[PDB]
């Protein structure tokens, strides 16, 4: 229609269970500034293993928008509902 919203795959450099968080951005960008952000993501290694919504690069390439990663990193499994075999 107009501009699409920016949704990439991004390394994510630590011991967190995944190795690749899928991100996106809060605002529509042209398709042309998708492939170039996804350039920067390639340079990219995110190591922080969070919630949802979590901001990564603020105003990345000096555009103004958020690229915020949508998946949950688990990166301490502790699962305290069963004790162990």
Known sequence: MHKDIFTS???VRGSKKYN???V?????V???????????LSRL???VPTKSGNV???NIMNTGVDIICTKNLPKDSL??????H
């Open 9 to 11: 795959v991004v390394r």
């Open 20 to 22: 690749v968080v899928p």
């Open 24 to 28: 996106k951005s809060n605002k529509p």
């Open 30 to 40: 042209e398709i042309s500034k998708w492939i170039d952000f996804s350039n920067v």
């Open 45 to 47: 290694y995110v190591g």
């Open 56 to 58: 990564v690069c603020k």
């Open 79 to 84: 699962e305290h509902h069963h004790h162990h």
